[PDB]
Amino acid sequence: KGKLSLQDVAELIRARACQRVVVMVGAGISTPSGIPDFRSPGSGLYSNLQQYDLPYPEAIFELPFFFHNPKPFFTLAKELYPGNYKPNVTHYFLRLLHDKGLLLRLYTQNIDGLERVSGIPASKLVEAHGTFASATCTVCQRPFPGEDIRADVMADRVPRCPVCTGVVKPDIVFFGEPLPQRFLLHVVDFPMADLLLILGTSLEVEPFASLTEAVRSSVPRLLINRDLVGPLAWHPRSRDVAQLGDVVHGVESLVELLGWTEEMRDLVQRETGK
Numbered sequence: 001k002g003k004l005s006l007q008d009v010a011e012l013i014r015a016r017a018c019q020r021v022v023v024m025v026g027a028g029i030s031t032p033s034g035i036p037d038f039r040s041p042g043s044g045l046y047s048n049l050q051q052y053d054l055p056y057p058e059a060i061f062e063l064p065f066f067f068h069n070p071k072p073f074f075t076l077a078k079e080l081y082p083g084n085y086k087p088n089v090t091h092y093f094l095r096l097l098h099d100k101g102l103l104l105r106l107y108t109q110n111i112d113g114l115e116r117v118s119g120i121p122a123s124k125l126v127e128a129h130g131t132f133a134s135a136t137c138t139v140c141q142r143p144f145p146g147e148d149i150r151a152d153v154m155a156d157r158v159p160r161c162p163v164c165t166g167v168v169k170p171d172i173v174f175f176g177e178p179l180p181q182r183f184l185l186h187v188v189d190f191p192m193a194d195l196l197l198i199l200g201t202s203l204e205v206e207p208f209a210s211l212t213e214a215v216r217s218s219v220p221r222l223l224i225n226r227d228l229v230g231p232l233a234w235h236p237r238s239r240d241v242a243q244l245g246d247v248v249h250g251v252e253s254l255v256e257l258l259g260w261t262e263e264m265r266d267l268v269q270r271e272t273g274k
């Protein structure tokens with residue numbers, strides 16, 4: 001009887017009636033950290049082809065172009081590597097969710113790695129478009145921690161495999177490649193979810209689009225996004241809640257209703273001092 005509200009979701013979490021939260025995030029959560037959506041006219045990455053020495057937008061994430069000229073991609077890597085951008089309130093909200101034993105899994109479309117930098121361990125993360133936290137030799141397939149090629153990336157050298165001399169590429173998923181193996185965790189995670197949180201994306205592209213329907217029909221789906229569009233708007237469920245407008249405000253409103261404001265402020269304080 002009647003729509004669930006943001007407060008109703010907050011109350012379920014406070015009661016630990018929702019304690020296996022699956023979170024899905026996109027570009028919208030990282031704009032307040034100073035990373036625009038790549039497609040943003042004027043400011044976004046795809047609108048700065050000259051700045052990266054690219055023939056066209058997609059090229060920075062294409063394998064044949066990468067092997068012809070790895071330097072534009074490595075320019076992006078240098079900018080996006082950990083330490084450059086700061087997580088914002090949205091990332092720390094998810095971190096708090098984790099610290100309180102409420103996070104089952106956080107699925108991210110972002111490559112900025114800000115979830116990790118916020119202190120969420122890799123085991124809770126499914127970085128569905130890959131990550132800079134690890135790298136792989138393109139010839140022999142030797143894996144490397146991201147830190148092991150940091151010096152070369154910061155020094156504008158194309159890192160190389162000690163074993164076979166192959167170019168070592170960050171584990172970002174390029175156009176036409178398979179999604180990472182960890183993505184198959186959705187098979188167990190989604191039936192297990194007792195709350196679905198979607199932040200700063202409308203999950204309009206597959207296979208993310210279908211995943212919104214993988215949770216059971218009793219599970220509330222909370223969308224915090226500019227607009228109510230995508231699969232959630234196409235196929236609403238009685239226990240869906242939409243918090244529209246600015247993601248930062250939506251998240252901060254939820255944080256307040258949860259009673260975590262002072263806890264958030266202390267966490268952010270501590271973390272900034274690192």
Ligand SMILES: CC(C)(C)C(=O)NCCC1CCN(c2ncnc3cc(C(N)=O)sc23)CC1
Pocket residue numbers: 027030035036037038039061109110111112113129172173174175176177
């Ligand atoms: C879907 C595949 C894997 C084929 C793909 O497009 N790979 C290239 C990397 C993606 C990463 C996510 N992505 C983004 N698009 C617009 N804005 C952002 C902001 C991102 C961020 N803040 O990490 S990722 C991203 C599209 C290109």
Ligand SMILES: [Zn+2]
Pocket residue numbers: 137138139140141142161162163164165166
């Ligand atoms: Zn190698």
